[PDB]
Amino acid sequence: GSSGSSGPARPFRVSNHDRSSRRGVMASSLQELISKTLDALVIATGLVTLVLEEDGTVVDTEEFFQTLGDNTHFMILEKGQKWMPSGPSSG
Template sequence: MEYLSALNPSGLLRSVSNMSSDLSRKVWTSAPPPQRPFRVCDHKRTIRKGLTAATRQELLDKAEKTLLLSEDLTLVLEEDGTTVDSEDFFQLLEDDTCLMVLESGQSWSPTRSGVLSYGLGREKPKHSKDIARITFDVYKQNPRDLFGSLNVKATFYGLYSMSCDFQGLGPKKVLREFLRWTSKLLQGLGHILLGISSTLRHVLEGAEQWQHRQGRLHAY
């Protein structure tokens, strides 16, 4: 009877289904993630290397050997310092993402685009005094921002300082602003075309009236 029950169609289908699910689960778990390219640098951005890795830990291991770093490393985004602290976050990163590897005690700092002072960076004389020092900082608040933000800081005579921050826009905001300005431009062009049309109509009506008056004068 047990042999006959094993030959039952429902039992056979159930066993085949269990075998296929187990096989697919083994195939799914055994397939490793693909190798992807990344660019890594140290906290001073003096050393940059291109590495390929499939997981976050693999990238940290390769960066430790390539950049000659110690253990207890932290992985952050180079552009804004966001910590890549999980494998799920790492898998969401795009290929060729720029990452910074920090050792214990190190911290992320924004990129300094340059300092303009006394001849655009030339060494000033020893006995000179700064009149104005202007610093430009380019950074991104969000990795998805289309344009970076710009911070301009000016210091006069080493005493008075002022700064201005130009916030960058993401793709959606840029598209929204573009559509808004396009709408205003089209509205302005529409008003101009309506004005030209009205002027031409008045000119044509005036010409017709003048011709009609000339015809009456010739008739008399």
């Protein structure tokens, strides 16, 4: 866990609560990604919740993360934030 990667990693997308930012992170597993995302978005704190940017389903399982295709959109939320669908308009 400290160093190294069990096999190749898969590409994935990430977006903040404002569903405005887009960060493409790659990880072999779920745990790895989550850890990366935080670093990418340089989030102030670590306590966060990763979910799907489609329905808002929290991904806390590896078996479910191994099924997700490539460039999978995700949604990060801080201690006190919920997921939200695609806004009807920006303005």
